[PDB]
């Protein structure tokens, strides 16, 4: 009966939105983080190109952000959800060593094995916090351990190999205390280049003023205090946690996404165009590793919707995620140019009203900055002519603002449209 329930859920095409909403229900916003975490949890199918090479099925995630941006909450949720989860840290204070090492027993003078965090989390989800601070031995061994997923030792005849195949979901803080968009991702993070290169999905959590989200988060925190006293952004049903766990276990036991259905021509064209932009601009070039990450994310999506075959929608979603991460890792001007160039791929399965909301946010930011520059203080209500929004929508070939006004997202952000004055009014 549980299998039939899982099959029935697989029948519903729009289950991805459900499970994306389910990830970290207590956390508000950061939809990119939730999407990445869901993709990591569902995992990708691993392959073995003979003995010469091995293709790992893990989807690593790195979360570099700002202080007080709900980074540890995601790790806690993944620990509480995913089975075989190991929580560690790198700062110290009895922190478990990331990689195993052979240290001869001091009292008995015998060579012994001391397992690391990666070894204790094999076939599971490893979680690291404060990943920027690490021991030098760990700093030099993490690269190889993540590359080969196995630690091999040879000391005085003791030839032991330990298997460490785990999904790493790390977090850290940037250099200087804040993330500077002017500099590249590598400069902001106090980590060597190969270590960052090993991670597939890179997510940046910046801190910006969003008064609506500020008020909602304040309500959430105060209500949490009240509950412990002594809202669907995706707008779609949220799956039960237990049924979600059964679905995940099904997606790791009775499914094997094959890559027979593929369009290598479009992938090659995307690779060539992205490499053109990267090399011409002088920023970080796209390598084959990004292609492999895209393939793994595509297989993860295929398992996510319980399809034995990879529908081209999953390929487009994987390309979207990879492009979003890679573009966001660039410099500010480079990121702007790359967003301007690549817009068709990035717009796959994006709500038009969502883009209208982005345009409205831009206009509100303009008005607020103008008010603070001229009047010094701000104003409770913000009104901007609709004509600018209509023109920018025509630029993106969008229209029918009345349907957007009738949308619940328009009301939730405290927007009101004055037809008589042709003005959109927002209250705080």
């Amino acid at each position: 009966e549980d299998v039939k329930a899982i099959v029935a859920l697989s029948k519903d095409e729009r289950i991805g939105e459900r499970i994306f909403a389910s990830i970290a229900p207590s956390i508000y916003g950061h939809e990119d983080i939730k999407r990445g975490l869901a993709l990591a949890l569902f995992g990708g199918e691993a392959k073995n190109p003979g003995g010469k090479h091995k293709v790992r099925g893990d989807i690593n995630v790195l979360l570099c952000g700002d202080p007080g941006t709900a980074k540890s909450q995601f790790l806690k949720y993944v620990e509480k959800v995913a089975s075989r989860a190991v929580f560690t840290t790198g700062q110290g204070a009895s922190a478990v060593g990331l990689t195993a090492y052979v240290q001869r027993h001091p009292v008995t003078k015998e060579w012994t094995l001391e397992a690391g965090a990666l070894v204790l989390a094999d076939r599971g989800v490893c979680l690291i916090d404060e990943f920027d601070k690490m021991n030098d031995q760990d700093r030099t061994s993490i690269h190889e351990a993540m590359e080969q997923q196995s630690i091999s030792i040879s000391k005085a005849g003791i030839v032991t190999s330990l298997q460490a195949r785990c999904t790493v979901i790390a977090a850290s803080n940037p250099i200087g205390g804040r993330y500077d968009p002017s500099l590249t991702f590598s400069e902001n993070v106090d980590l060597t280049e190969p270590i960052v290169s090993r991670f597939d999905i890179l997510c940046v959590v910046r801190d910006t003023v969003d008064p609506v989200q500020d008020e909602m988060l304040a309500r959430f925190v105060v209500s949490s205090h009240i509950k412990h006293h002594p809202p669907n952004t995706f707008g779609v049903e949220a799956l039960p946690q237990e049924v979600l766990k059964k679905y995940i276990m099904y997606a790791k036991e009775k499914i094997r996404p094959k890559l027979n259905q593929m369009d290598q021509d479009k992938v090659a064209k995307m690779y060539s165009d992205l490499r053109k932009e990267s090399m011409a601009t002088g920023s970080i070039p796209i390598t084959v590793r990004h292609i492999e990450s895209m393939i793994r994310m595509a297989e993860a999506h295929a398992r996510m919707h319980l399809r034995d075959y990879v529908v081209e929608d999953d390929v487009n979603m994987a390309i979207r995620v990879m492009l979003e991460s890679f573009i966001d890792t660039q410099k500010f001007s480079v990121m702007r140019s790359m967003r301007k160039t690549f817009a068709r791929y990035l717009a796959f399965r994006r709500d038009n009203n969502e883009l209208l909301l982005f345009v409205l946010k831009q206009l509100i930011a303009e008005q607020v900055t103008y008010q603070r520059n001229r009047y010094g203080a701000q104003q409770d209500t913000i009104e901007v002519p609709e004509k600018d929004l209509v023109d920018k929508a025509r630029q993106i070939n969008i229209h029918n603002l009345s349907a957007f006004y009738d949308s619940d997202l328009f009301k939730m952000n405290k927007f009101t449209h004055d037809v008589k004055k042709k003005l959109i009014i927002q209250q705080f």
């Binding site: 293709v55 005085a156 280049e193 090659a268 060539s272 492999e292």
Partner: protein, 321 residues
Amino acid sequence: AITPQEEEEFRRLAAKPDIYETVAKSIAPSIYGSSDIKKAIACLLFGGSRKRLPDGLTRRGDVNLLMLGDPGTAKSQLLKFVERCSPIGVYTSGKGSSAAGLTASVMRDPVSRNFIMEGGAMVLADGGVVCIDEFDKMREDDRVAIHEAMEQQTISIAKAGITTTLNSRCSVLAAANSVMPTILSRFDMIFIVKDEHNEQRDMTLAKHVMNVHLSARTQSSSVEGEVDLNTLKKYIAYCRAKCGPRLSAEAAEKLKNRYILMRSGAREHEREPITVRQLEAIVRISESLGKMKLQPFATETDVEEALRLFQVSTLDAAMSG
């Protein structure tokens, strides 16, 4: 343990005039492109010819490479493949487990109180190839060991009273992301592996990777025009243990003229350089080619090819920097 049938096969294979290009293609079939690097690796694998003069000093016959370039160019896979094709080889990764030993060490077993004298990886790889990855991350002691082994080719152990000197005659093939200067000066050919944005090349590489991932199930598919790894091993061992070539008089004249012209041009350009060391490196490359074709004398074409390889690698590395 080689049967006469295999010897006949080796003679037939070496008799072909296109053995050089065949060996170049046979190296790392999976990796696409980089023909010049493959040719240089072939030259390294076959190696030069060792000589002894009446004074007792012996001129070494090894060839050393170095691959510098951006990450993501599959250096590690190439090094691993090279390690599996030489009759004798070893793989050490820099700063990872101290890159194996790389230093002959004298530890004391505490229970038995005995002293054990393990040689380094270089000693174990005598008369072979030593592939090192992450050359710039080397520990200082291993850096000293590398400096000593590349110059005198004798690793010495002086600790805890025990004082001996081991022997290590190995060709070093190392790859690093970016720049110790003395060791970089010791190397014969320095390849700066850049990247290109030819649309055809990028599309072909992406298609090849995608096809490999698609045919992970069809990994049993073979390749044509290449040489099996065991056959390559036996061929390398036979050529190394049978034929040691020497230069001819005409090749010597041509090389001397080219060297004189190069040095005069370099001096004139500096007024607006190639040294004897690089001349000997070119000599060793020519001898390696001659040994590869199983001949007792290296012709002028070998000298021309060695000059071309040197110009492609070391001269271009000097000019770019």
